[PDB]
């Protein structure tokens, strides 16, 4: 009976980003005991509720959410004694919440999420004995949680996240016999989680994260079966994870990231066969990862980074055919990389950097069809980077730097279809760059520096998307290829600390955007082509420790660092000609 359904001649036009009361208020003076539902949601309306709404005495449903209503809460609505659900969320109501919701004795749903309320949560609501959902999140509520909200038997959903509440969590809330969902994080609560919460036997969803909580995690919450979602990240919990938590047989998502937890992942975690998401980022955890975590039938997300785990990664990880992202960077893992990680071709993000992994990159990883981001630098991986990565259709970011890769560089990298970043620096190759490395379609950043490269630099054929090229600190001999003006997107080039002879490629001056150039510590000879002084874009041109001769250019070279030279003579701006 909303949007002027029954007239209850007169208006049917409830639209037009106009304001209520007076566009409204006629709706009410159609006095009528015929109106049981009124839905004024998402009409772009702005203001106050008129006193006269008290005359819609038969209302059961009232939803005014998603407008711009303002002012303090209108206590006239408390005269709608038959109201059963009231949705006020996503408005601009402010001030302390006024008393009197008690008279809505049959109220079953109250949603006020996202408002401007301040002051204390209304202790008055503890008297709505039929209520089932309460949502006061998203405002500026202050103070403690009223311990009397624990008398809200019948209540199954409570949301108070995103205010500025604090104090200790009221132990009495643990008597909400029928509570299925509790979301109360993003506040300033202190102290620990009351162990009485272990009586919320129906609880499926438990947040309270990004608060100020502390203590050991209460062992008693192993009692919460039925629970599927447990978020307690961004707090101050210390101590170890209770081994009692292996009894949360329904748990699908676990997130303890950003606390101070110590000790090991409890090996009972290997029994949580419904786990989808295991996240323990940024803690003080240690020891080994229980092998059975590699056997979890539904695990999709495995975040263990920024701890100090020892030992090997579980051999069978990925064999469930479901892994999507794994990140264990910044630990002390050892051993080889399991072959099964991408079984199922669902793995798209594989992050392993800053460990001590050993052995050859498993060749199964070259047939991981879904792989997209691969970061494995700062390890001890040896052998030949296998061939096959350039045949993955979505691999765009690869970092294998600071490892121990030897022999050659896979030639299929140059034919990877969407690869955008490839590093490979620091590695001990002792062979040439792949002949068609510059061919590559998309590839903006390539950085094989200090990787014991040898031989000449291939001709810059194509060079479509490169904007940063790092090859410094190898033994590249020969001449810098003279067709470098094909690299029209180039911004930074470093070929310093090599064995390059010959002249500076004048085609460097076909420079739409070149900014940083470092050719120092080589054996170059010849002038700096005076045309370089016309570049309105070069800010660094380090060419020191070479065998160059002649004047330095002027123009946009006249205000460069003299240190950038150390060879012989140069335009008045140093040692006159």
């Amino acid at each position: 009976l909303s949007l002027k359904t029954s007239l209850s001649k007169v208006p049917v036009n409830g639209q037009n980003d106009a304001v209520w009361c007076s566009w409204s208020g006629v709706v009410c003076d159609n006095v009528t005991a015929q109106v049981i539902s009124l839905d004024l949601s998402h009409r772009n309306l702005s203001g106050r509720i008129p006193i006269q709404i008290r005359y819609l005495s038969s209302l059961l449903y009232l939803n005014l959410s998603g407008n711009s209503l303002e002012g303090s809460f209108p206590t006239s609505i408390f005269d709608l004694t038959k109201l059963t659900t009231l949705d006020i969320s996503r408005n601009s109501f402010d001030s302390s919440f006024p008393p009197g919701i008690s008279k809505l004795k049959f109220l079953k749903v109250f949603n006020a999420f996202s408002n401007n309320f301040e002051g204390l949560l209304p202790s008055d609501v503890s008297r709505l004995r039929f209520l089932e959902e309460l949502n006061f999140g998203g405002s500026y509520f202050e103070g403690e949680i009223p311990a009397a909200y624990g008398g809200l038997q019948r209540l199954k959903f409570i949301h108070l996240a995103g205010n500025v509440l604090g104090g200790k969590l009221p132990p009495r809330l643990g008597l909400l016999t029928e509570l299925q969902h509790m979301e109360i994080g993003y506040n300033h609560f202190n102290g620990n989680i009351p162990s009485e919460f272990a009586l919320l036997s129906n609880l499926k969803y438990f947040d309270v994260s990004n608060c100020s909580l502390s203590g050991s995690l209460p062992q008693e919450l192993g009692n919460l079966s039925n629970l599927e979602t447990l978020f307690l990240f961004q707090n101050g919990f210390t101590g170890e994870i209770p081994e009692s938590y292996s009894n949360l047989k329904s748990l699908k998502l676990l997130d303890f990231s950003s606390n101070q937890l110590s000790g090991s992942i409890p090996s009972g975690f290997s029994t949580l066969k419904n786990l989808t998401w295991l996240s323990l980022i940024s803690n003080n955890l240690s020891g080994e990862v229980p092998e059975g975590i590699g056997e979890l039938p539904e695990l999709t997300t495995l975040f263990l980074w920024n701890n100090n785990f020892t030992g090997v990664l579980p051999h069978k990880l990925g064999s469930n055919g479901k892994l999507e992202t794994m990140d264990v960077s910044n630990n002390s893992f050892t051993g080889t990389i399991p072959s099964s990680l991408c079984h199922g071709n669902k793995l798209y993000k594989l992050i392993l950097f800053s460990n001590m992994f050993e052995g050859e990159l498993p060749k199964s990883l070259t047939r991981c069809e879904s792989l997209w981001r691969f970061r494995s630098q700062n390890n001890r991986l040896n052998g030949t980077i296998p061939i096959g990565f350039g045949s993955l259709r979505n691999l765009t970011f690869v970092d294998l730097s600071n490892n121990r890769f030897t022999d050659q560089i896979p030639a299929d990298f140059a034919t990877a279809p969407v690869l955008q970043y490839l590093n490979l620096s620091t590695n001990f190759f002792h062979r040439k760059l792949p002949e068609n490395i510059w061919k590559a379609p998309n590839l903006q950043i390539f950085s094989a520096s200090f990787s014991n490269l040898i031989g000449e630099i291939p001709n810059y054929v194509g060079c479509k998307s490169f904007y940063r090229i790092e090859l410094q600190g190898n033994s590249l001999n020969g001449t810098i290829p003279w067709d470098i003006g094909h690299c029209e997107k180039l911004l930074c080039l470093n070929l310093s600390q090599n064995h390059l002879n010959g002249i500076i490629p004048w085609e460097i001056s076909t420079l739409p955007s070149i900014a940083d150039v470092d050719l120092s510590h080589n054996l170059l000879t010849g002038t700096i082509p005076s045309d370089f002084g016309s570049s309105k874009t070069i800010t660094t041109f380090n060419v020191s420790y070479n065998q160059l001769i002649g004047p330095i250019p002027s123009g946009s070279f006249a205000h460069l660092n003299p240190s950038f030279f150390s060879s012989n003579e140069g335009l008045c701006g140093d040692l006159v000609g």
Partner: peptide, 12 residues
Amino acid sequence: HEVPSGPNPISN
């Protein structure tokens, strides 16, 4: 005002 929900979005 809006309030974040879900797991921790932090990533590498």
